[PDB]
Each structure stands twice: as C-alpha cells, then as structure tokens.
Amino acid sequence: GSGVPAFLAKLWRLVDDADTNRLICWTKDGQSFVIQNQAQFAKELLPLNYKHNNMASFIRQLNMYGFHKITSIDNGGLRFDRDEIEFSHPFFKRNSPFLLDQIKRK
Numbered sequence: 001g002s003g004v005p006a007f008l009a010k011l012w013r014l015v016d017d018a019d020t021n022r023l024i025c026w027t028k029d030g031q032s033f034v035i036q037n038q039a040q041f042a043k044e045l046l047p048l049n050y051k052h053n054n055m056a057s058f059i060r061q062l063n064m065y066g067f068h069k070i071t072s073i074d075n076g077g078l079r080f081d082r083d084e085i086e087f088s089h090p091f092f093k094r095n096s097p098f099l100l101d102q103i104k105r106k
Contacts, residue, residue, distance in 0.1 A: 004100045032088045
C-alpha cells in the first residue's frame with residue numbers, strides 16, 4: 001500500500017483471506033508466521049501466482065531476501081521436530097507499511 005513490490009504484498013494477502021491457515025498461519029498473536037505443511041504447502045499456493053511450482057526454490061529464495069527459520073537446532077532429543085518450518089523477520093508483522101520498503105534481494 002505504498003510502493004510495496006508484489007512478491008511481499010502477496011504474502012500479506014496470502015497469510016490471511018482465510019484460504020490457507022493449515023498450510024500457513026501466524027504464530028503467537030500476529031508477529032512471525034509458521035508453515036507446518038511443506039508438500040501441500042507448494043502445489044496449491046505457489047501456482048496460479050508465480051507460475052513456477054517446485055518448493056525448495058521458494059525457500060532458497062527466502063534467504064536471498066534476508067529471512068532466518070528458527071528450526072536449525074541440530075542438537076536435541078525431546079519430541080518436537082515434525083516439519084516445523086518456522087520463519088522470523090524483524091520487519092514483517094501486521095499493520096506496518098514501513099517494514100517492507102526495506103526488503104530487497106541482497
């Protein structure tokens with residue numbers, strides 16, 4: 001809503017409009033966003049939009065912008081771990097027409 005690219009503008013319209021949730025929803029109140037599903041979270045939301053399907057491509061792209069998933073651990077033992085792909089960005093929340101303009105490919 002202020003010279004924001006379409007890629008990001010779509011996310012705001014993707015994590016809402018009540019049409020995905022299960023594949024992607026907000027985490028705690030409304031700050032970051034998680035994507036429990038991976039497969040199903042690919043051949044249904046990426047097409048009819050970017051055209052290109054695949055999935056690891058949409059992720060290796062999240063890094064090109066500047067994202068960091070909170071599921072690296074690489075050392076634990078408790079249950080958890082079940083495709084919990086979490087995403088965090090100190091510049092992506094609800095009403096905030098000033099956290100996007102500062103997001104572009106490195």
